[model samples]
Every structure is written in C-alpha cells, then in structure tokens.
Target: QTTPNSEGWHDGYYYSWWSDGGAQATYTNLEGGTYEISWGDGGNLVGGKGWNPGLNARAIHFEGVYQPNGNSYLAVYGWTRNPLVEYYIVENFGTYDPSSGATDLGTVECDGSIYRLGKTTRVNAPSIDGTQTFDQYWSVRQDKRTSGTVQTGCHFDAWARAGLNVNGDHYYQIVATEGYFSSGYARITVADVG
Candidate 1:
C-alpha cells in the first residue's frame, strides 16, 4: 500500500499537487523524514512535499541524487499565510537557473553558503488557498549541492531582512523537485525528526 501519490499525506509533512502542461507529479512516503518523488514527462510542475503547517528553526537534512532533464530545480517549496507567500530554497538546478525570472533581492549568507534572493508576484495564481494572489520568494544557492542541512530559520530571517516578510498561516512546505518543459525523477531522504 506504499506507492507514488499524486497528492496525499506522509510521515511528517503532508502533500498534494498543482500541475500543468501535462506535467505530472507523485510522492511516496518512506520513513519519518524520508520521501521520494518523481515527475512524469508532462514535466511542468513543482512536486515534492514537506511539512504541513511548516515552522521555522527546523533544519532540512537531506541527500538527493536526482534525475532531471531540461530546466529543473531541486529545492524546498512551500507557502505561508497572512500575506500569502510561496517560497523556494533551490539547492541544485538543471539547465535553467531559476533566479533569472525573479526581481533580484540581493543575497543572504545562510548555512555558510551564499544564496541569491528574489521575489515575484503571482497574481491570481494557483496556491495553497487556491486561485489567489501572492508573493513568490526564492533562495537560490549559487553553487549546486545534493546533500546537506538547510536551516529554515536562516533562510526565513534572510527573507524577512529583505522585506519579503511572511508571517501568516503555516501551510504545507515540501522539499521537492520542480521541472518545466522537462521531466525528472528523485529519491531523497530527510534526516530529521519531529
């Protein structure tokens, strides 16, 4: 009864989907902090899930040896409320660099690594609340890494410092892989406990 889920709950963080362009997504629960996900050739969605009502201060310790084609991202994707903010912490990327699409908000030093910060507006877009307008925040690492610990607080503070503050509903946050006009497969495990 353990298999790929297009949208469902798992060990710690719960999940679901938002896909387009024939891009397909599925998530599988492993142990407590481990999960696996894959993107079908339709390939134009962000799928890979994390914590439900996600909180800061918790660190994401993971190992990702993923298969991605074209422009893709290996990042943490989630949302927050009040101002309704969707965020990303891209650890690794494929052909296209995600930061290029955003309005650069400079950089922040986190976990001893420098991350490019940016934010964009999603007007009446698909979100946790569904068909809403919100801000999309990003923390893209200049260097590509596959395994490490991501301190959520570090990135949160950095986002706040840049005036991209998000203090609202703690919605679903996930460590996922995203691809556009491409396909991807990933096996990742998070090494932290609730």
Candidate 2:
C-alpha cells in the first residue's frame, strides 16, 4: 500500500499528492515533443500542468497528442484567482468525475475533436492562498480517445458565453491525470502551446 500525503502540496515533479496522487511535467517554450507520465499500482495518477502569469481574459491555447495506459486520463484544467474558478477538458481512460451537481452543456468542437461539456459547483476547492469555493466547467471527449491530438482553449470565452458567474484573474493552466484505486499512466506530446 502506498502512503498518502497530508492535505498540502509537495514537490518532486512526480508522484506528488495535494489531495490527489499524480505526476506533473512543468515546462516552457514551444519546441514541443513527447512527454511520458506514469505511476505505480495501488491508486496512482500522472500528467502535466504548464502555467504562466495572470491574464485579463486572454485566450490560452494548447494542443498535443495524448496516450494513456492503466486507469488514467488525459486532461487540461484552467484556474483563475480572486473569485477562483476552474475549466476542465478531459479524455477519460476510466471513470472521470471532478465534481458533483454536473449539468450537461452539450457538445462542442475544440482543436479537432468533439466534446460533451458540463458544469459543476464545488465549495472550498484547493487554491494557492488556501481553500476557495467556485464553479467548474468541464468538457469530455465524446469518443474514448487513448491516443490523439487533443487541443482546446477559449475556456473563459465559453464561460462568458454561457452567461454564468464569470469574474476572476487568470491563474495557471494544468494538464494532469487522477488515478483512484489503481495504477495510471499517460504520455503527452506538446504540439503547440502558449
């Protein structure tokens, strides 16, 4: 049995837990290529999250090939400060549920794939300064895609278009996998990022 980390952030760029178990690849620049992320059995997770400074509703674009093995997922999460909120886009290799009270928002094409979108309200979620309560919007790939170029952006744009509660400062963007009760692994190639 693997040990769990106390509810907080730890470093290593691999197998770190801050309420979840996963690996992270933090990178910069545009010379992108293949990145492999993997974790062991007994409930593991793996992926990456590249970030930048704050932006005033600027459009963030990222695209790449995603491949997964074991109980894993290829996903992207966007976060904002102040009135914190998160936008999630994911390709599931297993059960993927980020929050409860999810309402379906239909399908939309991003990058090149069609995704089923939805929204959820999460109270007291994780944050840089402590805990925060906010709404989270999500998009899941319509078809199970273990290997494909998953590209997307316009998270803030979609939020505004929905006429929902939209107000916050752009924080970091993340690409990660969450494994539960099993091992998980995934590899992501950086095709184009910003």
Candidate 3:
C-alpha cells in the first residue's frame, strides 16, 4: 500500500498522481527510512529537502526502487546558493521525456551503471531562495533499473566532467518521483542511505 506525505520547496505535498484523487498542498519533515508515497492524477511524491553546505563535500546514496505504474521518474534534485546551480539524478525516468533539449555529456560509469550526463538552464524557473534563475545538471541512468544502490557523488562527478561548475554552497537536496498526468502511483523505498 501507499501513503501520503508532505514535502517540497515552499509548500507542496508529495504524491504519485492517480486520476481519481484531488490535490493536496502542504509539507512536513521526514526521517530517513522506507516510505510508500502515493498520489493522484497531477502531483508528485517529493522527499523533504535536505539542506547542506555546498562548499563542504556532501553525498547521498539512495537504495530503493520505484514501483512501475505510469509516466514517472525516481530522482534526486538539489540547488546551490552562490553561482546559482541546480542538479538532479534520474535514477529511473520511467518513460518520461528524457530528451527535452538535454545535450549529452558522455558516459559516466559508476554506482553499478553508466550514466548519460547533461545540463540545461530553465528560464524563469521557480526558486525557494527568492532567485529567478538556476542551471540544471542531470545524470540520467544509461541502463535504467527499478531498484539498486546509487551514490550521489558519482553523479556530481559526471556534472563536473560536463563543465558544470559547482563551486557554491548547496541549498537543499530532494528525492522525488515526478509524475505526469496519468492514473497510477509510484512508491520509492529507501532501504539504505548515505
């Protein structure tokens, strides 16, 4: 079974959209562990943002899998303060739009799979820090697996290889499942973490 949880940038709840249920808008802190997140039609299951100092070395290893249902993605997203940088890891982009103007940065073999790195800047992107712009670096899994262990530092290395400078303090890091307009739910369980 799945459970509803609250978490986002400012105030947005996390769930895997199902066509039947409506929307919910509120969030709260969550402890690190296994959680079953459910949603409906037009929302996402978002993990609480993990705030960290960007200057200091940081890493998170996600050990879980997304239950296959519809168009969804199991990812880790984050932002930095100085220089304005946003990064993400597409551990599993379950039939989502993987090529949305995303340029390839080559193969990064690590964490049990080869990742295709890329970056793009979202114009007029929403920010929690009152900023208007941010650069997004992505490390998409070359061989998509529904379950496994992943180290965030390897993805960061891929970003660095792609010339995406990350020389600032990290604002927040989040793990989530981005859902499209579909009738199904995706739940990710964190069996282990780092």
Candidate 4:
C-alpha cells in the first residue's frame, strides 16, 4: 500500500516519499538518525520518517550535508487530524525562504536559535488526509543551518502564544524534506526520533 499513500518501514522507523510531477529520487536509511537522499528536477519530493499520530511535544537533533538546486527545506513536519493542520519546524533551506509571502507571526527563541513564525493556508490541497483545506504553520530559523537541535514543543507553545494553537489528535510527524522544482541531494547525519 505504498506509492503515494506510502506506509513502509525503514530500519526501525517508517518512511514516505512523494512527488507530484513524478520526480526521480531515492531515500536510503542508515542506523540512528541518518539517511542518504537524491531528488530530481520538477515537482516536489517531500517525505521522510513517519511518527504516526505525532506527539504533542517533540525534541530532535538533526544534521546533514545538503546541496540544493532550486528550492528546498529541512524540518520537523507533521499534521493534526480534527483541525487538520500542517506544521513545519524549518531548520534550513536552499534557494527559497519559505517564510516569504506568509503572514508574519513574530519569532521565538528556542533550542539554540531564534525562529520567525508564519501562517499560510492551503485550500483544497494535497495532505496526509488527501485533498482538503488546512492551515500550514511555518517556523523558519532566523539563520539557516544544516545541522542543529530542535525543541518542537517550544515552537508549538510559541505558536499558541501567537494565537495559533495546535489541537486535536495528531497525525504523522516526521523529520521531513521539501525539494521543489529542482534536483537536490543530501546525506543526513542525524535525525534522531523518539
């Protein structure tokens, strides 16, 4: 039951990889918060580990050697069910700053850096639950780094402080990637999951 609605295991973790325009890519799993990936041009290849029914508080450390061609992001990505929210804890990017064109919601000092917050809406768009209306939450770091630690609950609390709260049962939460309209490559050194 893979291929778009992918449900598979990688090492001891679950993984997913999807591209709308049929981009060529590969995700190779290694032990303990590490993986190797290469993606092609056109469309977006966005998927990683699956923490089905994501936790309310998540803490993680990540590192990777990445090369981006057009646009990309590294983050702890996930969703909520009842409210159907898509959230990102963007740690780094290539070529595109995802916070652009979003409603600026201020910033939060969490983990080891300051992160700027933004809110975006996706109307009748693709999601874990399929075509639906949902809010996309963005937490982009003030400075991009290929490696760092993230205390996601801190960001969630920050989001709540900004009038954006996360409610309802959680869905798949994973240390994820979004590579768009270009070829990209990365070897993740750490993406520890609890």
Q: Write the candidate numbers in order of decreasing lDDT.
A: 4, 1, 3, 2
lDDT of 4: 0.77
- Give per-residue lDDT, candidate 4, residue 84: 86
Tens digits of per-residue lDDT, candidate 2, 114-168, equal 7767888777766556787887777776675554444444544555666755567
Q: Estimate every model's Cα lDDT from 0 to 1.
A: 0.75, 0.51, 0.57, 0.77
The C-alpha stretches of model 3 lying farther than 4 A from their native spots are: 1-31, 43-45, 48-59, 63-65, 191-194
Candidate 1 lDDT trough over 10 residues, lowest sum: 1-10
Best lDDT among the predictions, by candidate number: 4
Q: Which wins on lDDT, candidate 2 or candidate 4?
A: 4
Q: Give the best candidate by TM-score.
A: 4
- Show the colliding residue pairs in model 3: 15-44, 15-45, 16-39, 17-40, 17-41, 18-39, 18-40, 18-41, 54-169, 54-170
RMSD of 4: 2.6
Sort by TM-score, best first: what order? 4, 1, 3, 2
- Candidate 1, 106-183: lDDT as tens digits: 888887789999988989887667799888888998778988888888888988888877687788777877778776
Query: Residue-wise lDDT of candidate 4 within 86-164, one digit each (tens)?
Result: 8999988888797789999998998778899999999999877779998989999977788777877898898999998
lDDT of candidate 4 at residue 17, scale 0 to 100: 66
**TM-score for each prediction?**
0.87, 0.65, 0.72, 0.89
Candidate 3 or 1, higher TM-score: 1
